[PDB]
Design a protein around this nucleic acid. Structure first.
Length: 66
RNA sequence: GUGUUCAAAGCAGGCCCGAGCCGCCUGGAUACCGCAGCUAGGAAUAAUGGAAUAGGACCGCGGUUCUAUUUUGUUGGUUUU
């Protein structure tokens, strides 16, 4: 809910042939909607079939929210 | 520098764009160096120098003499400055 992947510091990694960015998602009261959702959500942002979108990170911010 | 939610701390960090911003962006300072040395300014202070039965400055020079090598095209010879 109210997810909004905020692609901060987007890096067209040309020598690793990829889109490289920081995922920064928002929440009402429950942090960290699941990773493969975020893949599928970052899929439809970029239309890139998200099983090539290999995400990680995803630590839950205190107070839900982000 | 830096909101680690304060803090112990870290070296961080911050954005806009919907997510084509295909990115933009701060940064990660400065302080310390036993000595000995080095460096170069000082020359007080503390030591420190000389002319004494004369020495120091002036090409004062003098006469002697050693020898060093440039030119005499060159070398060789000697000769000198």
């Amino acid at each position: 809910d109210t997810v909004t992947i905020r692609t901060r510091k987007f890096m067209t990694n040309r020598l690793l042939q990829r889109k490289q960015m920081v995922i920064d998602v928002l929440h009402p009261g429950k942090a960290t909607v699941p990773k493969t959702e975020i893949q599928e959500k970052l899929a439809k942002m970029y239309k890139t079939t998200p099983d090539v979108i290999f995400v990680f990170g995803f630590r839950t911010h205190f107070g839900g929210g982000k």
